[PDB]
Swiss-Prot record, chains A, B:
The modification Phosphoserine is found at S88. This is Dynein light chain 1, cytoplasmic. Weaker expression in the cerebellum and spinal cord compared with other brain regions. The modification N6-acetyllysine is found at K36. Acts as one of several non-catalytic accessory components of the cytoplasmic dynein 1 complex that are thought to be involved in linking dynein to cargos and to adapter proteins that regulate dynein function. Cytoplasmic dynein 1 acts as a motor for the intracellular retrograde motility of vesicles and organelles along microtubules. May play a role in changing or maintaining the spatial distribution of cytoskeletal structures. In addition to its role in cytoskeleton and transport, acts as a protein-protein adapter, which inhibits and/or sequesters target proteins. Pfam families: Dynein_light. It is found in: Cytoplasm, Cytoskeleton, Microtubule organizing center, Centrosome; Chromosome; Cytoplasm, Cytoskeleton; Nucleus. PROSITE patterns: DYNEIN_LIGHT_1 (PS01239). There is a cross-link at K43 (Glycyl lysine isopeptide (Lys-Gly) (interchain with G-Cter in SUMO2)).
Length: 89, 89
């Protein structure tokens, strides 16, 4: 339907926001396979695209446990990766 | 019977705090070997043993990239795991 090659697991963010969030994690997922890196680029884009600052943790076998403390927190697992997006706004 | 068996990679929290954080991460590791689990166990105690809210990420192949702050954002890698402790105080 709209890409989204992930597998959410916990997203305290608006649905549509969770779909665009995953795709963005994908952008960094396809451009780079470096957990940290992917998270870096993303955060930058999500911030300039939405409004700084997005606390994201992308991996492939970790265990994120942050407090969204907002409404822009989405967790999911891409084809072979995981993204933990959440701002401290 | 000694924790702190991690490998910090980026910390912005009080020294004794980053040390206690690692042990707390280890505590969750000894009680459970599940990323998410370890993360929860940590944030849980750290939140009720320091001052809410602690956002930590425990994994061994992920990539954390968030805008830390306050003074409780420690990052390390245990014997075979990693932890990303950071609040939004």
């Amino acid at each position: 339907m709209c890409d989204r090659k992930a597998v959410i697991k916990n997203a305290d963010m608006s649905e549509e926001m969770q779909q665009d969030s995953v795709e963005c994690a994908t952008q960094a997922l396809e451009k780079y396979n470096i957990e940290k890196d992917i998270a870096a680029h993303i955060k930058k884009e999500f911030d300039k695209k939405y409004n700084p600052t997005w606390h994201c943790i992308v991996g492939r076998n970790f265990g994120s446990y942050v407090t969204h403390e907002t409404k822009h927190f989405i967790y999911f697992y891409l084809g072979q990766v995981a993204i933990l997006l959440f701002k401290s706004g």
